[PDB]
Every structure is written in C-alpha cells, then in structure tokens.
Symmetry: D2
Subunit: 118 residues, 4 copies
C-alpha cells in the first residue's frame, strides 16, 4: 500500500513504487525550496513487516539535482507507513546542504512531513 502517489502537508508530490525486494523508487516534487519539477528518489522498506499492527519502517533519499537545477543538497526521509482507513506515511527528515568548512555547523536541517494519498 506504499506504492502510489502521496502528498505531504506542504503540497509536495511523492510518487513511489514499492518493490518486492524492499526497493523504493520514484520521483519527488517539492512545493518549496531550491527545486523545480521532478527529482529521482530511491529508498528501502521492510518488505516483511510485523503483524502486531506495527507500521512499516521505510526511508528514501533525494539529491536535489535534475536537468533544470542543482541545489547542492540532499534530503533523506525516515519514517513509517501506517495503512488502513486513512493510510499515511509519517516521516522525519534531514536536509543536508553541501557547505564549506566555515559553514558545516549549519549544514543540516531537520523536519517532519506527513504524507497521504489525498
């Protein structure tokens, strides 16, 4: 139920395919930041989750470079797929920008995105 098109609270578009091998592949489109259009993503998920009602641990990465722009940054999302009536993917993320030594202390942003199919 992870496969498909999801949207986060910012309006970004997350188009994913969950592979039988635990592979996550698709595209990301950010509604904010130093980005336009679609970027390649790749990630992994637990292809055999618990059955105690636990959610499904997953992760994916986007390097913010494509044919039109390069922000010299990468975001990783970590969280879990929670299926059911209201399916949702709950994440926290790290966005690291390429910096010089002077700026490394402030290289990494952290946040949380919530994805739904609606």
């Amino acid at each position: 139920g992870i496969t498909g098109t999801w949207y986060n609270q910012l309006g970004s578009t997350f188009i994913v395919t969950a592979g039988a091998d635990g592979a996550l592949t698709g595209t990301y489109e950010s509604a904010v930041g130093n980005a336009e259009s679609r970027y390649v993503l790749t990630g992994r998920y637990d292809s055999a989750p618990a059955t105690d009602g636990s959610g499904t641990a997953l992760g994916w990465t986007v390097a913010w470079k494509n044919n039109y722009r390069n922000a010299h940054s990468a975001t990783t999302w970590s969280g879990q797929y929670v299926g059911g009536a209201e399916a949702r993917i709950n994440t926290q993320w790290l966005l690291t920008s390429g910096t010089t030594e002077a700026n490394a202390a402030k290289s990494t942003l952290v946040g949380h995105d919530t994805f739904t199919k609606v």
Copy 2:
C-alpha cells in the same frame, strides 16, 4: 572519491559505489544493534557539486532486513562527503522502527556517524 570502503566510529563498514547518474549503491554492515551480516543500501548524491570547495551532499537508506534477521526498522544517513588528505563523510542519521501508534512517540532515534577510510 566516494566509491569504496568506509568505516564509521562504531566499527561499521559502508561499501558503496557512486554511479555517474548520482546513484549510490552498496552494502552496509553494522557493528552494533539488531543486525548481523550485510544489508542492501541505496541512495543519491550530488554528481555535480560546487567548485568552491563545499562538500558533496549525499544520502542513503538501509532497511534492516536480510536473509538473517529483520529488525523491522530503517536508517537514513544524510550528510556530505569531503575530500582531502583525510577524506571524510560526515552524517546525521534517523533510525525509525515500526511501532503501533501508541509508541509512535518513541519510534525514531537520531544520531551522527563519521565515515573515514
């Protein structure tokens, strides 16, 4: 520069090749935690970073399931590679465990790993 074998402060081994497309592929072996053997990784990196000496942004994911165990979790490392006499990859990571919504507050660990050759 990135392709190769890397070790972090915990004794884990990160084996990756950086494709020219900006794909990261490889294998991760953790020294600690609910793990044993190798796990598949995949990620992405800035295959055209700035010329000013900034580092190279990158990220990768490991779900902790292989033929041996399944921790029912995934880690994502977000960082940058820095070349030099001492090449380094400095990261921050998020380790999320599957949980019921009751314990979702405690699902996600945060940490930092430094990789070196």
Copy 3:
C-alpha cells in the same frame, strides 16, 4: 502570548511562565512515556523577537525525575511560538536517555510536538 497552559497532541500539558527576563519556567505533564505527575521545566526565549511577523524562538528542558519517579532521561524542545487566532508553539524535540557506552548509539529519540491553547 507564551505564558499559560498549553497542550500537545499526545495530550501532555505544558504550563509555562515567560519571564520578562527571557526566562521560561514551569511544569510539564506528559501523557506518554515513563512519566507520572508534573515535572519541573526550564528554558529560554527571544524576549525581543522580530516585528516582521516571524515566530518567537524558544526552548526548554525537562529532566524526567520528580518525587514519584525518575526515568533517567531528559527532553529538550526547540521551537517557535506563533501568535494569531490559532496560537501555536511548533517544536522539535530530542529525548536523551542515560545509557552505557555500549548502547549509546540508541540513547536519543527525536520527534515533534505542536502545542495549542486548546
């Protein structure tokens, strides 16, 4: 706008006094975790924030030790206060537990809390 009673989404209760000082004092009641009753908090805030509409930066700390219990852990919330009809305090937090240096790779949890007047 900061002083008073606030609630997050776990149902925890945050009772603060914002000192002229830049001081934050109060008590925290957490709904979830190895917790019981009220705990002392202390923190700091920008007592001269931007006029330009930006939020009011703040942070606080709770060590989870009181008369009833001691979880040997500490949470810090970092965030910002946002005035308006729906006042909110939007935070990210770090929960560190005391561990041996074996398990220290799993000592710190991260998450986010949104506090509302209701």
Copy 4:
C-alpha cells in the same frame, strides 16, 4: 561532576553549574554563528543517575540574545554526561530560528557537539 568549564569541538565555551535540585545554569559562548560573547543558559539534569555505568541525562537551552546582539534563535542541547578518565558530555542539538509560516520548513538546524574539559 557536571559543574565546570567545558569546550566543544568548535571551541565554544560552556560554563555550567549543576544545582542540587537538578538545575543547570551558566553561560554559553559560541565560536561560530550569529553570536558574540556570553549568553545565559538554563537547563536540567538527572540528579540521581543509575550506577550501572549509565551516563547522566541532561539538557540546556540558549536563546541567542544578549546585550550585544539578537539572532532571534534558540538552541537546545540534549545529551548525557559521561564521567571517568575521559569525562565528556555528548550531545545533539536543535537550533530553531524564528521564521514566518512560509519558511518554517527551514527553521530548524540539527547537529552534535562533544564537550570536554580541555
């Protein structure tokens, strides 16, 4: 043995006093970012840690306003004190800036500092 003068890898200066009741007070001086001289800090620590060799959980806040400047930001450090030969405090920190609703996705930085007495 938390009271005293500590330095992190950036060469910032962390002067702290741990009171009986679990209080933390002191002064923080950053070697980096939008800061100059000392800023008041405040926090909490577990005043009755385990004895199994586990470290002492602690956390503190700095709002980055003093008589010289104001960055409209606040940093929290969450971590633990670890005694012995190499007495150190290992932390993770969250640095939130006051932003408008629009740029809140980039309000929060994350990092880690290691404090030593040398």
